[model samples]
Target: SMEQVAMELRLTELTRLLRSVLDQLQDKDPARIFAQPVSLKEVPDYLDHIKHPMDFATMRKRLEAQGYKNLHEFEEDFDLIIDNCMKYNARDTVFYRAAVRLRDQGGVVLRQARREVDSIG
Candidate 1:
């Protein structure tokens, strides 16, 4: 069909684009990608900065040795520290909760990021 041909044509271009761009990102350390942050401000920024949510759940599998037991230790440790800073309306929890929304949406970005990291030496 006409539509099917057009879709395949776009898919071919997209495949090439994905490979070249990821090939550039492949130089970065996967450990840093999977590692838990030192501060609460660090958790959500992964989506915006590296273009990957870096979800600990899926990212853990990509690692040769998983550093964190799970996302709880990765996120909660910072959540507690940030919670302490909030005395009034409690903004940190609300903010981090929004980050959680985007992080879970990482589906293919997470998978593609993993493949990119794996390709790295």
Candidate 2:
């Protein structure tokens, strides 16, 4: 019971931390383009250019399912959404610019959470 309690608390903290990170990104995306997966109909070559796709909705789904085992795993998916945008869209495009903004803001939030989690150990 003692060991299990500590582990449950740790898991709960990690879940909360990841949810905050996801919420911040969703809130900051003014255009809300990153809220869902890229439309294949609109961007016909989306799958071709970006092998792995990630989005806020997908992240939320996985987070709810407890799909991520650690913060780094969550961060990887977060980074993927940004990286995919930059790769699929040109530098001058709005999507690329939004990705840059999200990267800057999300990166700070993620790093802060990491520190908070580390301190708890």
Candidate 3:
């Protein structure tokens, strides 16, 4: 019980100190926060800045449109690409995986762009 009480007291003190600081930030200007480099992303999404067919926006839209809704669609596409890429004995699987990765990361990049672009004119 004493340990629990101490833990609670410590938590309470910590909460007070943190709240005091956070309170100042409660109404601070968005543009001010913009100056601080918030975590841009959990993972980097931009790949193939030059050679890839789609930018983040285009790749994301293409991915969104893809059904992959059924097993057959996924299987067919996977077999066509990965299977062939492997069977062909190519040193680089880049061509095979590139398109799919682009779509996947494109969605994330687009999401990040939307967040960073928030309320920016």
Local accuracy by lDDT, each model? 0.38, 0.86, 0.35
Off by over 4 Å in 1: 30-32, 35-121
Task: Return the clash pairs for model 2, or none.
Answer: none
**Backbone clashes in model 1, listed as residue pairs:** none
What candidate 2 gets wrong by more than 4 Å, as runs, is 1-6
- Candidate 3 Cα lDDT to native: 0.35
Per-residue lDDT of model 3, residues 71-108, tens digit only: 23322432332333333334465543543443344344
Which residue runs of candidate 3 sit more than 4 Å off their true CA positions? Answer: 30-121
Put the candidates in TM-score order, highest first: 2, 1, 3
Residue 37 Cα positional deviation in candidate 2, in Å, after optimal superposition: 0.4
User: Of the candidates numbered 2 and 3, which has the greater lDDT value?
Assistant: 2
Q: Which residue pairs in candidate 3 have backbone atoms (N, alpha carbon, C) closer than 3 angstroms, thus clashing?
A: none
- Best model per lDDT: 2
Error (Å) of candidate 1 at residue 48 is 20
Q: Which model, 1 or 2, shows the larger lDDT?
A: 2
Point out the higher-scoring one by TM-score: 1 or 3: 1
Backbone collision tally, model 2: 0
